């Protein structure tokens, strides 16, 4: 309504879906699919029944390398998975017809539970889902196997690992996409605490879908943090539309134009497209002949640069088939673009700095690790407001297996549980559908 | 209706605890200390002068209309607006007639609008000054709840609830608020309850004989009445503990079948 | 040409500072340094006696140290030299005491307590009663127990550094109080500064409690506030005898030890999980107020550079060096800001350029002045590095060059405009101009906050906007990387040194750290670091009286 | 339905409203009024325009005794305050049929802004309200008065205050009823953050309404913490109904029966009512008399004991007309009841433990503050799951101005803002009406 | 980076967990040491049978 | 090349020790840095700890 710029819509295969779609159609505040994803991500919990059985059988309660001799329970949770799921569903159900579901995953080896939305309406935050699921699991295990009154403590330690003493679920067998609120590095960072490996495993290593998932989460978080309000909203709307949903097919076009190219070729393609579309114009011609450029549309130029950054990351990490080039590509795409055009980087240097720290902590002794363990809540990658993580997800999708902390190593339970929902697995094709649904309401 | 018991047990200690808890039981008085003497030992106000106020009388101040708040009749000290003061007692572990938790329970069962606090070697009750003086003279000082030797009205430095008695059977006092007058055999308070000396010592009677102390005490002791001699109290305590445990585990009628 | 860093280069380097060539591999390795030989002998004795043959220090493994000449280090504005090993925060007791004095300081205001005592508790408050309370708290704060011999007390010789002091903006109350334990604003500050501080403080009374250093050594920084509050409550209920009830005592306790408490640092969230009074929670303005050079010096450059030295020694050496990384640490990163007069020369050139072009504070903060001042200072510093090869050898790491040049540029911009955010913007412009000039910068990532800075310097977003005085190590951009925070504190100080301000962020901290009873005198941090590097600094927190002599 | 419990609802004057109301009609998961109060608490923000003006005029940015010389802005926020409100509403506005309530308080010196629910449907936590309001306020202040580009940081410090360095709003002039989620005592503890004084001030010192407010908040929080799940849901529902909403008129009946009585008389009346209602029966008669009592209904006995606890607090604090008796009253009510009947107290000793916490928190030099600042998000008062706090509201309502932490001193702005909402000013009446509106669906 | 991540969190064992939020304390503080950890610290089990 | 170092006298209590439940690896390991489970614990306790 207040934004007059339209965008096209292309799928992950580069085929046209619709034209003249208003920019607000993909907004988190309007798109039904983004609202549904945020609502479902708060109520979905992953349960490791096999992990519970193994922890109880060996007394592995406590956390890393911790055993309590004497507190050993022999139960058959995986065999009685259907009964346990039925009991948990009965406990968590609000009335009859709420959206309470406990599906069986991997032949009862895992559980995917969805607490009802009615239990979250009167909740201030998202922690109600995990606590309610933990209590339901404790009650179901106590009343299925007639566990002694003096062993409910062991059952609780098996389900959540240290929670009263450690404000987290570290040694437990229960998990969710979002981290604990005590792990947030800033206010409004709840949606930024999804690691790259979780997003890659949820989308089953699909590059475009992982980009869409990560970008949607990051921009919805920027809306939550209050960053994308007032005059800052259009910039983030365009960043989500172009870098994350390839609105004008920019990402696929750049990758196609640079199938056997380098980062510099991608930069040249981005500048050529920006000039052709009128986004940037020649400011002045210097004495040496350098053509300094100025943005005719600042936010559109930002979106074009972000799409080009994603394309450059894809090109380089597909040429190498290794996900360790992400930080260098993100750094030097901006570094060469700025001194080729005289224009600011993707996020006015905020993404380049994120890359300069990512290169620090991905190649040194001081912390960090593989690119898959980073997230928007991380102290190293929190600095770019939703413009640096989708490239990392794309690169980790392009990896061929050169990383030790791969999504399989880190996100096995979370990925397997959250891949069962079509909205999480293929966010691109459903966000496009949600935008098409409200196309005519603006 | 419901006729209230007050405490389990058949020993003399349990009966004394029941008597202290019973509001309809008239405590036997063993001395006569004038109201002004009690006020002087208390040390908060000079006797004969008016009570200091913290707020105007309740009629002067304006409150919003509250049907439930107006159902309760206020104390006279509240009606006038008097400052809240305290009276504190230390009880010896050697057969003192009243004990901290027993004192607090009896206070909250017998008096209106009181604030009772219990420590191992201390017990304090706070109330509006006029009513506080009234029930300090009537119940706390003149009755069997007070023994000038084994118990002592004392603030500030409290110590000696677990120490042995001195040569006169008196509880240890680091400030020596009360001394024993051998000429008359009476205990005299030479200081008020916080420690500033009194101009004229006040006679608070003579120490209760130890034989009577054995009968009127509310503490369990191996030399006196032991808890092993009162299995009914132990059973009730264990029942309370088990009920608490079962309620904290799973509060259902089925889990309480194992009570 | 005359440069302030020339004399140190003459003393440190045998060849001409302008000479482009030298020779290596002829110094004997680690034997060229007396400190390394002392370390070797100490390692041998320690291994043989205490370690029962387990090796501790083996110079033969790893890099062959001393292939080049290990230079000595001057200390800026001081005529004394020391080896680089003496400036390590573990080997330097002066830096340890610098952190100890800040850690063990809590400022509590006593005006709500006095008002509650007078009105609610019905107890008169007089200067004699205040003196009695000060005596009580001075006895009780270290380990004391008032009129209670049966209570266990700390050995008095173990807490000789513990003091309880008082200061007030009320002149008559100040001169009615005992001078034994009073921080006199009038006689510690110049007349105009004292007037400004009294006007800012008001007519209120504050007490400063210096918890003994040993308490912070054994425990963490969050212990200091609890220790202070407990001792203050005990001393208040002992000096003033109150016959009121215990609820009134709870109200008095809140008024006396939880109403006007001022802490040095805040608690940190997430992965920096720490309590209060830790170096990561100290804001740049607070650290500028801790350093007391505005009291004894009128030179703005010196005032900014003392804060630069203190901030380097704290943030880079202790906080980031050990609290966040650990190991050998980042000594040479921070010493480059306060060892030779390189930063002094650059900052003096920046001040001279600003005075000649824009005046002392003659311009409102605009973009153009930021660009031109920062560019000129950066170009001067980089050409100074270029034409003095000994200078480039002294600052061998690009991080120990980028930080120095950017600090000079930021100090110049802050002089010109008086705005700290303009100064930090000039810092960031200097950093990128340095990168384009030398095709080089610091370490890997290092310039995470320098590429993100230009956009975050004047930002208005929630997690990006803050005045530079209100920023600190917990600012998201500044959380991890070395070589910035100590210079950010100096830029924040220079924002106010241009205006001749008596304080930067908190008058109470400025008055509290003017106390003569502090072990580390914050008037000359560089001189005290020099003294500590020479093993002539008397630090506190040593358990000599509870340990065997053998 | 799953609970056969029926309750009769009485108003604050002791008059019957409805009979045979299902117990779940007052449940937080079903009651519309509780949902509305939770949403309003989440989306309501209070702005102190006079505080902003004073901080900017004197340069008082930075907290306790902090002040930055030279960073002073002379703006007239209270003079404008309609312009600023209009700009803030325009920025925060999402749609046309949108809540976005910004209303002037005290003639321009305060603002009561209600962030639209659209910005909270795509937020994982409640912190979006304060951040969005702060951003909108910063933009409105920068645009209304032409603030220079180099003073936006000063404006931010005046509005929010030390936030990037101190992860909270310490020296700011923007406030909300809920604190930062990173500063919670435990997971799900967000709703137990409203102190007793705020509840009393919002209800305008009405005893029953303040009790209802505190009980509703505490029991909704217990539902959020996962405590009221499965076997504990019935006990928490009964506790809410009988302690907060005056079900069966027990609180009023006990207060009327003990107008001239003491705590012991209240205990006697509670036991008599429990015996008459069949809640407790005689277990066995010991040798020394003392017929032991066992609960025929454990949860109903706990609810009766909680109602009697509230009545005893009201009786004692109305006799003394002082709010300093709450800790002793709760402690020794539980003690006397336990050793009178052989039955467990309220919350199986947790109420007594929390009363001990109140005692040592408000009655010594290691005490701190008074009973008016009690809330469930404190280490001292977190132990009882919504059974020890509501009586403190009655105690503070009965106080005749003898407390330093009086509601007028600590909650004037809170009362002025939240007293406008009908569901907050009279929680009891509107919760009863909401329960009546959903009577027939069970 | 793999070594650093392993040694910083994957394979590290801390005596005491961190206490973020209200408690506001770092790891390896006495408030983070569980009772079983302190029981394992004491080595009387391997030198005495009582 | 060109680092400062801490004084070894201040770090005489600093040790890096290695222990392993693998007896074959613990056999050809330098006993200076090895925490021997077999030597420090009784037979049954050593076996339990190794398991
Ligand atoms: C191994 C690393 C990776 C890492 O995380 N840190 C290292 C090593 C580390 C170790 C040194 C261990 C030791 O003494 O052997 C420590 C002390 C960190 C620690 N607490 O362990 C350190 N560096 Ni580094 N490190 C420094 C520096 C530097 C400069 C050296 C400039 C150059 O001549 O090339 C470069 C960065 C660069 O890429 O330019 C550097 C790199 C590196 N630094 C590279 C590679 C070193 C190499 O020579 O092979 N340090 C310096 O610039 C000076 C300050 C110095 C720090 C110690 C001090 O302040 O005394 C030290 C700080
Ligand atoms: C949370 C805090 O309580 P507060 O909030 O009421 O200060 C809690 N306890 C305290 O009250 C503070 C310090 C411990 C003091 C206890 C000393 S036991 S010896 C004194 C007995 S008497 O003074 O009651 O007679 C703590 O910090 O550990
Ligand atoms: C990034 C993060 O490391 P982690 O991956 O979380 O372990 C963080 N390190 C740091 O901040 C390192 C700062 C000091 C070392 C580098 C100085 S340039 C920390 O310890 O919490
Ligand atoms: O150069 S690195 O970034 O590896 C570390 C510098 S000490």
């Amino acid at each position: 309504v207040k934004y007059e710029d339209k965008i096209s819509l292309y799928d992950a295969k580069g085929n046209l879906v619709a034209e003249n779609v208003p920019l607000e159609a993909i907004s988190p505040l309007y798109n039904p699919t983004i609202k549904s994803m945020v609502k479902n991500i708060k109520r979905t919990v992953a349960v490791n029944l096999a992990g519970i059985e193994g922890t109880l059988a060996a007394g592995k309660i406590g956390g890393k390398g911790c055993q309590v001799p004497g507190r050993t329970l022999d139960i058959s949770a995986v065999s009685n998975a259907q009964a346990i799921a039925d009991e948990v569903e009965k406990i968590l159900k609000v009335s009859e017809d709420d959206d309470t579901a406990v599906k069986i995953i991997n032949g009862g080896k895992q559980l995917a539970v969805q607490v009802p939305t009615a239990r979250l309406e009167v909740a201030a935050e998202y922690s109600v889902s995990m606590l309610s699921t933990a209590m339901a699991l404790k009650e179901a295990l106590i009343k299925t196997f007639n566990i002694d009154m003096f062993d409910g403590s062991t059952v609780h330690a098996a389900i959540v690992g240290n929670y009263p003493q450690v404000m987290d679920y570290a040694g437990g067998n229960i998990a969710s996409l979002l981290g604990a609120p005590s792990m947030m590095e800033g206010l409004g960072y709840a949606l930024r605490n999804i690691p790259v490996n979780h997003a890659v495993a949820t989308t089953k290593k699909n590059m475009m879908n992982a980009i869409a998932f990560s970008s949607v989460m990051e921009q919805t978080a920027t809306f939550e943090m209050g960053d994308a309000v007032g005059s800052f909203e259009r910039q983030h709307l365009l960043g989500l539309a172009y870098q994350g949903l390839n609105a004008d097919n920019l990402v696929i076009d750049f990758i196609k134009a640079n199938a056997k190219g380098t980062v510099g070729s991608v930069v040249e393609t981005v500048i050529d497209r920006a000039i052709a579309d009128g986004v940037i114009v020649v400011d002045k011609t210097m004495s040496s002949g350098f053509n300094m450029y100025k943005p005719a549309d600042v936010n559109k130029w930002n979106a074009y640069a972000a799409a080009g950054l994603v394309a450059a990351v894809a090109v380089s990490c597909g040429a190498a088939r290794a996900a360790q080039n992400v930080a260098s590509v993100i750094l030097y795409f901006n570094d060469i673009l700025e001194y080729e055009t005289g224009l600011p980087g993707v996020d006015y240097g905020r993404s380049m700095g994120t890359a300069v720290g990512f290169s620090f902590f991905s190649h040194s002794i001081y912390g960090g690790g593989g690119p898959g363990i980073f997230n928007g809540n991380h102290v190293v990658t929190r600095h770019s407001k939703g413009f640096a993580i989708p490239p990392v997800c794309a690169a980790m999708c392009a990896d061929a297996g050169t990383q030790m902390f791969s999504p399989e190593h880190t996100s096995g339970l979370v990925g397997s549980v959250y891949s069962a929902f079509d909205e999480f697995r293929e966010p691109m094709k459903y966000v496009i559908e949600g935008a098409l649904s409200i196309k005519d309401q603006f | 209706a419901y006729t209230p018991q007050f405490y389990p047990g058949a020993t003399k200690v349990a009966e004394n605890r029941r008597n202290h808890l019973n509001p309809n039981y008239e405590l036997e008085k063993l001395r006569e200390i004038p109201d002004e003497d009690v006020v002087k030992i208390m040390g908060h106000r000079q006797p004969g002068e008016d009570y200091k106020t913290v707020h105007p009388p309740l009629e002067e101040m304006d409150f919003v209309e509250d049907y439930a708040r107006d159902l309760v009749e206020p104390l006279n000290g509240a009606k006038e607006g008097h400052r809240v003061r305290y009276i504190q007692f230390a009880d010896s572990m050697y057969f003192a007639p009243a004990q901290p938790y027993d004192r607090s329970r009896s206070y909250m069962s017998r008096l209106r609008g009181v604030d009772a606090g219990t420590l191992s070697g201390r017990q304090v009750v706070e109330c509006r000054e006029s009513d506080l003086e009234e029930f300090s003279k009537n119940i706390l000082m003149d009755t069997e709840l007070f023994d000038p030797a084994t118990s002592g009205m004392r603030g500030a430095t409290v110590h000696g609830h677990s120490l042995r008695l001195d040569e006169n059977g008196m509880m240890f006092d680091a400030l020596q608020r009360c001394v024993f007058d051998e000429k008359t055999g009476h205990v005299m308070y030479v200081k008020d309850q916080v420690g500033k000396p009194l101009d004229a010592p006040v006679d608070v009677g003579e120490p209760i004989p130890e034989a009577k102390l054995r009968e009127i005490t509310t503490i369990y002791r191996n030399d006196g009445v032991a808890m092993r001699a009162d299995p009914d109290v132990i059973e009730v305590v264990k029942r309370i503990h088990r009920a608490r445990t079962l309620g904290g585990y799973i509060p259902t009628n089925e889990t309480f079948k194992g009570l | 040409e005359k440069r302030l860093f020339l004399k140190a280069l003459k003393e440190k380097f045998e060849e001409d500072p302008k000479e482009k060539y030298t020779k290596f591999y002829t110094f004997g390795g680690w034997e060229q340094s007396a400190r390394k030989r002392e370390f070797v002998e100490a390692n041998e004795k320690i291994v043989s006696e205490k370690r029962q043959g387990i090796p501790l220090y083996n110079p033969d493994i790893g890099v062959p140290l001393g292939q080049r000449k290990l230079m000595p280090y001057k200390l800026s504005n001081t005529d004394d030299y020391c080896e680089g090993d003496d400036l390590h925060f573990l080997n330097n007791a002066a830096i340890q005491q610098l952190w100890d004095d800040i850690r063990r300081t809590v400022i509590v205001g006593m005006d709500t307590a006095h008002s509650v005592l007078e009105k609610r508790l019905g107890v008169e408050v007089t200067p004699e009663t205040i003196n009695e309370y000060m005596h009580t708290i001075n006895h009780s704060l270290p380990g004391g127990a008032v009129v209670q011999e049966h209570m266990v007390e700390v050995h008095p010789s173990l807490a000789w550094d513990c003091y309880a002091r008082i200061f007030t903006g009320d002149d008559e109350l100040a001169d009615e109080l005992d001078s034994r334990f009073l921080i006199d604003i009038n006689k510690l500050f110049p007349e105009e500064q004292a007037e400004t501080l009294k006007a800012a403080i008001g007519k209120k009374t504050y007490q400063v409690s210096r918890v003994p250093s040993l308490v912070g050594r054994v425990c963490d920084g969050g212990t200091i506030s609890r220790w202070s509050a407990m001792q203050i409550g005990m001393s208040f209920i002992t000096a003033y005898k109150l016959c009121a009830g215990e609820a009134a005592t709870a109200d008095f306790s809140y008024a006396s030890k939880h109403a006007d408490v001022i802490q040095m640092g805040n608690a940190l969230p997430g992965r920096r999980a720490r309590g209060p009074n830790e170096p990561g929670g100290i804001r740049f303005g607070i650290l500028s107020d801790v350093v007391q050079t505005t009291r004894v010096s009128e030179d703005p450059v010196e005032q900014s550079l003392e804060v630069v030295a203190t901030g380097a020694a704290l943030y880079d050496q202790i906080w980031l060096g050990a609290y966040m990384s650990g190991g050998i640490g980042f000594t040479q990163y921070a010493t480059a800001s306060y060892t030779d007069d390189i930063l002094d020369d650059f900052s003096y050139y920046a001040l001279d350029y600003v005075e000649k072009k824009y005046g002392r504070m003659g311009t409102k903060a605009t973009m153009d002045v930021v660009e031109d001042v920062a560019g000129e200072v950066t170009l001067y510093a980089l050409e100074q590095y270029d034409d003095y090869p000994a200078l480039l050898e002294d600052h061998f790491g690009g991080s120990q060059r980028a930080a120095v040049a950017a600090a000079a540029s930021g100090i110049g911009v802050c002089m010109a405009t008086g705005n700290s955010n303009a100064g930090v913007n000039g810092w960031y412009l200097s950093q990128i101009l340095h990168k384009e000039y030398h095709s080089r910068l610091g370490f890997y990532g290092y310039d995470l906050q320098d590429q993100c800075g230009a956009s975050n310097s004047l930002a208005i977003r929630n997690d990006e906007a803050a005045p530079l005085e209100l920023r600190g190590p917990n600012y998201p951009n500044y959380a991890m990387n070395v070589g910035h925070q100590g210079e950010y504190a100096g830029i924040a100080q220079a924002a106010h040194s241009a205006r001749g301000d008596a304080f930067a962020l908190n008058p109470l901290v400025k008055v509290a750290f003017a106390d003569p009873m502090l072990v580390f005198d914050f008037s000359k941090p560089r001189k005290e670091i020099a003294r500590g590097a020479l093993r002539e600094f008397e630090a506190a927190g040593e358990r000599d009286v509870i340990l065997p002599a053998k």
Side-chain angles (χ1 to χ4, degrees), chain A residues 366 368, chain C residues 271 324-325 443 480 482:
Chain A
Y366 289 100
Chain C
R271 64 191 80 226
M324 287 306 276
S325 78
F443 52 95
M480 323 150 261
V482 83

PDB file of all heavy atoms in Angstrom, chain A residues 366 368, chain C residues 271 324-325 443 480 482, ligand 3:
ATOM      1  N   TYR A 366      40.890 -19.151  18.175  1.00  0.00           N
ATOM      2  CA  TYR A 366      40.228 -18.330  19.179  1.00  0.00           C
ATOM      3  C   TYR A 366      38.759 -18.666  19.378  1.00  0.00           C
ATOM      4  O   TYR A 366      38.104 -18.027  20.208  1.00  0.00           O
ATOM      5  CB  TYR A 366      40.359 -16.853  18.809  1.00  0.00           C
ATOM      6  CG  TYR A 366      41.756 -16.311  18.970  1.00  0.00           C
ATOM      7  CD1 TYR A 366      42.588 -16.160  17.872  1.00  0.00           C
ATOM      8  CD2 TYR A 366      42.251 -15.965  20.217  1.00  0.00           C
ATOM      9  CE1 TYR A 366      43.863 -15.663  18.007  1.00  0.00           C
ATOM     10  CE2 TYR A 366      43.529 -15.468  20.362  1.00  0.00           C
ATOM     11  CZ  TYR A 366      44.330 -15.321  19.252  1.00  0.00           C
ATOM     12  OH  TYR A 366      45.605 -14.827  19.379  1.00  0.00           O
ATOM     13  N   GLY A 368      34.927 -20.226  17.383  1.00  0.00           N
ATOM     14  CA  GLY A 368      34.237 -20.547  16.147  1.00  0.00           C
ATOM     15  C   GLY A 368      34.364 -22.019  15.808  1.00  0.00           C
ATOM     16  O   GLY A 368      34.415 -22.884  16.686  1.00  0.00           O
TER      17      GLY A 368
ATOM     18  N   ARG C 271      27.363 -15.704  26.125  1.00  0.00           N
ATOM     19  CA  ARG C 271      28.652 -16.436  26.243  1.00  0.00           C
ATOM     20  C   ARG C 271      29.686 -15.634  27.037  1.00  0.00           C
ATOM     21  O   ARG C 271      30.700 -16.234  27.431  1.00  0.00           O
ATOM     22  CB  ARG C 271      29.182 -16.764  24.845  1.00  0.00           C
ATOM     23  CG  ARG C 271      29.522 -15.540  24.008  1.00  0.00           C
ATOM     24  CD  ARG C 271      29.785 -15.923  22.566  1.00  0.00           C
ATOM     25  NE  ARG C 271      28.554 -16.113  21.813  1.00  0.00           N
ATOM     26  CZ  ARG C 271      28.319 -17.141  21.009  1.00  0.00           C
ATOM     27  NH1 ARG C 271      29.266 -18.035  20.785  1.00  0.00           N
ATOM     28  NH2 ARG C 271      27.136 -17.276  20.437  1.00  0.00           N
ATOM     29  N   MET C 324      39.101 -13.437  28.068  1.00  0.00           N
ATOM     30  CA  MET C 324      38.412 -13.909  26.877  1.00  0.00           C
ATOM     31  C   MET C 324      39.237 -14.872  26.038  1.00  0.00           C
ATOM     32  O   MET C 324      38.661 -15.726  25.358  1.00  0.00           O
ATOM     33  CB  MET C 324      37.992 -12.717  26.009  1.00  0.00           C
ATOM     34  CG  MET C 324      36.834 -11.923  26.587  1.00  0.00           C
ATOM     35  SD  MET C 324      35.398 -12.938  26.975  1.00  0.00           S
ATOM     36  CE  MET C 324      34.590 -13.004  25.383  1.00  0.00           C
ATOM     37  N   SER C 325      40.566 -14.758  26.047  1.00  0.00           N
ATOM     38  CA  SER C 325      41.405 -15.696  25.308  1.00  0.00           C
ATOM     39  C   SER C 325      42.301 -16.516  26.224  1.00  0.00           C
ATOM     40  O   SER C 325      42.191 -17.744  26.246  1.00  0.00           O
ATOM     41  CB  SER C 325      42.250 -14.945  24.273  1.00  0.00           C
ATOM     42  OG  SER C 325      43.361 -14.314  24.884  1.00  0.00           O
ATOM     43  N   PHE C 443      44.853  -8.448  11.790  1.00  0.00           N
ATOM     44  CA  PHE C 443      44.699  -9.881  11.567  1.00  0.00           C
ATOM     45  C   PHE C 443      43.393 -10.208  10.849  1.00  0.00           C
ATOM     46  O   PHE C 443      42.780  -9.323  10.248  1.00  0.00           O
ATOM     47  CB  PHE C 443      44.829 -10.655  12.885  1.00  0.00           C
ATOM     48  CG  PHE C 443      43.949 -10.149  13.988  1.00  0.00           C
ATOM     49  CD1 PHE C 443      42.710 -10.713  14.222  1.00  0.00           C
ATOM     50  CD2 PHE C 443      44.380  -9.127  14.812  1.00  0.00           C
ATOM     51  CE1 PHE C 443      41.909 -10.249  15.241  1.00  0.00           C
ATOM     52  CE2 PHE C 443      43.587  -8.665  15.833  1.00  0.00           C
ATOM     53  CZ  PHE C 443      42.349  -9.220  16.043  1.00  0.00           C
ATOM     54  N   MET C 480      34.752  -8.860  20.659  1.00  0.00           N
ATOM     55  CA  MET C 480      35.769  -9.895  20.535  1.00  0.00           C
ATOM     56  C   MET C 480      37.170  -9.392  20.224  1.00  0.00           C
ATOM     57  O   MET C 480      38.127  -9.895  20.811  1.00  0.00           O
ATOM     58  CB  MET C 480      35.374 -10.901  19.443  1.00  0.00           C
ATOM     59  CG  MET C 480      33.888 -11.190  19.373  1.00  0.00           C
ATOM     60  SD  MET C 480      33.358 -11.615  17.705  1.00  0.00           S
ATOM     61  CE  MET C 480      32.682 -10.049  17.161  1.00  0.00           C
ATOM     62  N   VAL C 482      40.781  -7.460  19.425  1.00  0.00           N
ATOM     63  CA  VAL C 482      41.748  -6.676  20.180  1.00  0.00           C
ATOM     64  C   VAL C 482      42.157  -5.441  19.382  1.00  0.00           C
ATOM     65  O   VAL C 482      41.967  -5.357  18.166  1.00  0.00           O
ATOM     66  CB  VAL C 482      42.969  -7.544  20.539  1.00  0.00           C
ATOM     67  CG1 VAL C 482      43.948  -7.583  19.381  1.00  0.00           C
ATOM     68  CG2 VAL C 482      43.642  -7.044  21.801  1.00  0.00           C
TER      69      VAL C 482
HETATM   70  C1  LIG G   3      33.712 -15.927  19.621  1.00  0.00           C
HETATM   71  C2  LIG G   3      33.498 -16.628  20.957  1.00  0.00           C
HETATM   72  O1  LIG G   3      34.152 -17.860  20.921  1.00  0.00           O
HETATM   73  P1  LIG G   3      33.247 -19.231  21.018  1.00  0.00           P
HETATM   74  O2  LIG G   3      33.144 -19.868  19.655  1.00  0.00           O
HETATM   75  O3  LIG G   3      31.866 -18.893  21.523  1.00  0.00           O
HETATM   76  O4  LIG G   3      33.921 -20.180  21.978  1.00  0.00           O
HETATM   77  C3  LIG G   3      34.099 -15.774  22.070  1.00  0.00           C
HETATM   78  N1  LIG G   3      35.521 -15.600  21.860  1.00  0.00           N
HETATM   79  C4  LIG G   3      36.098 -14.278  21.973  1.00  0.00           C
HETATM   80  O5  LIG G   3      35.412 -13.351  22.230  1.00  0.00           O
HETATM   81  C5  LIG G   3      37.592 -14.087  21.759  1.00  0.00           C
HETATM   82  C6  LIG G   3      38.054 -12.723  22.257  1.00  0.00           C
HETATM   83  C7  LIG G   3      39.523 -12.726  22.666  1.00  0.00           C
HETATM   84  C8  LIG G   3      40.394 -13.471  21.659  1.00  0.00           C
HETATM   85  C9  LIG G   3      40.549 -12.717  20.343  1.00  0.00           C
HETATM   86  C10 LIG G   3      41.040 -11.292  20.563  1.00  0.00           C
HETATM   87  S1  LIG G   3      41.373 -10.538  18.950  1.00  0.00           S
HETATM   88  C11 LIG G   3      33.876 -16.413  23.441  1.00  0.00           C
HETATM   89  O6  LIG G   3      34.853 -16.890  24.076  1.00  0.00           O
HETATM   90  O7  LIG G   3      32.723 -16.458  23.942  1.00  0.00           O
END
